[PDB]
Amino acid sequence: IPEKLEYFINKYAEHSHDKWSMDKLANGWIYGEIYSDSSKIQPLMLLSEKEKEIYRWPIKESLKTMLAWDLHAMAEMMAENYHNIWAKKKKLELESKGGGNHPLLVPYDTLTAKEKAKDREKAQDIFKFLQISGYVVSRGXXXXXXXXXXXXXXXXXXXXXXXXXXX
């Protein structure tokens, strides 16, 4: 984790908290020490102490896979990681408890479209802030190169053909 990105971690957490506060003021949520959902009372105005931070916690984790692994490519890869971590915890806990089978125990190329969009939403939400701050990220002529490779292959084949015709 870079020092500059670690600096922006807190500010992006505050901006996501501001967006969620803005949604919850659209809903109607007033601060109150008592924990409830039917009374519309929560002590950080339904996000509890740890649940106000549960979505900030994996931002640094996305940073680690970002550095360890164009914009659409990073988006789909981050969505894949976001669903894979949840699938890992789900499979681990179901193997521990001996529970039932979850229809998300399938590779990511088979999931339903809504299951991809659910984590694609969070992926784009975190990526827009990296984009506005100027962080040029990739995954980490083409036709002319392909033609050149084809020509090289043809040269090899021609060498082989010359060797064959010599015989």
How much of the sequence lies in strands comes to under 5%
For the largest beta sheet, what order do the strands appear in spatially? 1-2
Cα(first) to Cα(last) distance is: 62 Å
Counted beta strands: 2
PDB class: membrane protein
Keywords: calcium, calcium channel, calcium transport, ion transport, ionic channel, metal transport, ER/SR membrane, ryanodine receptor, ryanodine, receptor, wild type, membrane protein
Entry title: Structure of recombinant RyR2 (EGTA dataset, class 2, closed state)
Name: Ryanodine receptor 2
Concise summary:
Sequence repeats lie at residues 70-140. The chain is mainly α.
Question: How would you describe this protein?
Answer:
With 167 residues, the chain is mostly helical. It contains five helices and two strands; from the N terminus they run αββαααα. The chain has a two-stranded parallel sheet.
Key attributes of the depicted protein:
1 chains, about 170 residues, mainly alpha
Topology diagram in text:
Layout: H1 3-27, E1 30-31, E2 41-42, H2 57-68, H3 71-97, H4 113-132, H5 142-166
Parallel strand pairs: 1-2
Helix pairs in contact: 3-4
